[PDB]
């Protein structure tokens, strides 16, 4: 007991670093896997794509919610989504099923969140920057957009809709 059992403790400690490290690496591995597949398109684009918040809903690709979905390949569509003090334009976003959807989201005011219930889409929207995420919806139906970043008194009420067509 004790000192004799001190040798045991600094040795069991060695096994536990050994084991902790191996399980942490298996996680690193299983993340890696998600990084190499379709699921990875929810990661925001690296590049800085700057815009001007005070202009963004008057001039440019965000100023007309009618013109928010553009077909940008045979099976690809781009959607200019504006997240604003207390809703989303367009409402609804109307996207086909099976298509790569490329969201380009910005704000004219403060930070908002864009969390699409039932998907991994979960990006912060920053006034002056463009959040670009990619996703393919495999199931038609409605998907509520939640704003999950406090933005003011109307926050708990900021929701949107994706309608992805049968």
């Amino acid at each position: 007991d004790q000192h004799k059992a001190h040798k045991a403790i600094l040795a069991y400690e060695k096994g536990w670093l050994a084991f902790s490290l191996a399980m942490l690496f298996v996680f690193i591995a299983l993340i890696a896997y998600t990084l190499a597949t379709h699921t990875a398109g929810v990661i925001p684009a690296g590049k800085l794509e700057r815009v001007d918040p005070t202009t963004v809903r008057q001039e440019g690709p965000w100023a007309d919610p009618a013109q928010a979905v553009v077909q940008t390949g045979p099976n690809q569509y781009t959607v200019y989504v504006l997240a604003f003090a207390f809703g989303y334009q367009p409402n609804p976003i109307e996207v086909p099923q099976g298509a790569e959807i490329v969201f380009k989201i910005t704000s004219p005011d403060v930070i908002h969140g864009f969390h699409v219930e039932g998907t991994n889409i979960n990006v912060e929207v920053l006034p002056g920057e463009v959040s670009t995420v990619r996703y393919t919806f495999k199931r038609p139906g409605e998907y509520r957009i939640i704003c999950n970043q406090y933005c003011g008194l109307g926050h708990q009420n900021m929701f949107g809709t994706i309608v992805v067509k049968e």
Binding site: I9, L10, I28, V42, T54, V110, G118, L126, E129, Q156
Partner: protein, 557 residues
Amino acid sequence: SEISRVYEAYPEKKATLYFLVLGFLALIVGSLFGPFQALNYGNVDAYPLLKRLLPFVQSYYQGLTLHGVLNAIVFTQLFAQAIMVYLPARELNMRPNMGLMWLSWWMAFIGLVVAALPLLANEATVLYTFYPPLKGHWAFYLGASVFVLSTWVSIYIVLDLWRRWKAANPGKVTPLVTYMAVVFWLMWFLASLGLVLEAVLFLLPWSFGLVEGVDPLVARTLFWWTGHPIVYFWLLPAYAIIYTILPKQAGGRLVSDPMARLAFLLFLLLSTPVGFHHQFADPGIDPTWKMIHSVLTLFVAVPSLMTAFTVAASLEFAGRLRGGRGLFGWIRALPWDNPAFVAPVLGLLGFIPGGAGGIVNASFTLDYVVHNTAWVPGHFHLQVASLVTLTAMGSLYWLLPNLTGKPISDAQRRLGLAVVWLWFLGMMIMAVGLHWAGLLNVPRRAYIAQVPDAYPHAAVPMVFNVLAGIVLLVALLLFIYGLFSVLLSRERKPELAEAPLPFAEVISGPEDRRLVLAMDRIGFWFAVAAILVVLAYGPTLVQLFGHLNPVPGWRLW
């Protein structure tokens, strides 16, 4: 002058006592919003009630700001200034410089006072992360700045103690508690660079009217430079208490001094270069850098997995010594009738799922499942409001006697144990509901009681949230009564306060001194720490500071 001659042989008790009292006062007020918020996540609106008790409260989100700023920033910082100055001072029997210590306290008081004014005036309802371009009163940023900056005076105070003690003992190894304190204050110095740079460059000139706006991506990247390590600044005081005090109150020894040193050394290295894990969902920050900060984040949990075994085995050793018998004999041999001991051990239990949730959160792509849902508060209430707070509540039992004199009566020990078990139990119950409402996509930071039809899939973990609101309301109230009662009840008594804290004897072996020697090259490791920071934030900040996109400020409350 003092007939409590205390504060002229050890006046470092006088300062410490002010740090703790003010910190526990912040906890009480900040926490008063707690149960209201728990019932909100329970789909019961109770702000019509609160607004009539506290007529100054304009909204749920003013509540959440005050709750956040007052609990997570202010109580915790003050608990850290107290513990991490006074424990190393006592281990070394030296006096902290008192002109500076009274300054640090004054800088923190002037700070809280100044920040608190616009918060109660509803002029800075921007949450404790104050994300631009939400714009607070200038007095909130200047308050938080001076309040934060009072930790620099504390860093000086401790390195000074260390310099002087080394001078008097050439070739002696830094004693354990002091070693902890030193890596800890050095780690906080690196850490705070970020939030300091966000204030001085951006936030302060913005809100005085000196520039029209701020880049939110940089403001948020500087913030999280400080924002992750700041949780380790909350945790390590408790870890300090847990490593060097708890085992003695438990009957035992710390089973390893190098182990504990190692843990702390590892927090100096890896606590700061990891804040991109709060930005998994930000634009304009390269996916590759997120993968680095993610691997590095998983490394910051290794010291903690070590603490788990090290603490566990110390408790086990104590337990056996106190007649504890089988696989699990040793748990009921621990002093369950002492709140000093119970509060941090319950904290540790809560810590098990709290840490497993952080690991999930840290795993980059897995953070898309849970980011900004109720799951996150689920996670941190298990960490800070449970372990860190409970180690502070339990402190009151062995530290307050030590500082004041006033001994704990049996009915005070008893109320202690009610509080601590109810606090623990309320937190576990709140954790489930918030973890579960999170996986059902309920957002954090929301007055969801105003949209009561909105999250119908969440009806049942919403009952859990109500249940806990009510438990934690009982416990907070039992605490307020208990805390005021430990201070107020007239026991202005002599002896038992002439006390060095119940520090632990430690087990020694042949493989101590070579490890301990290496880890004591503090200048070396701080440089490695500062190099890891540059290598982790540097590439990304160069790009951003070259591409500043200031945007107008908004007030949305």
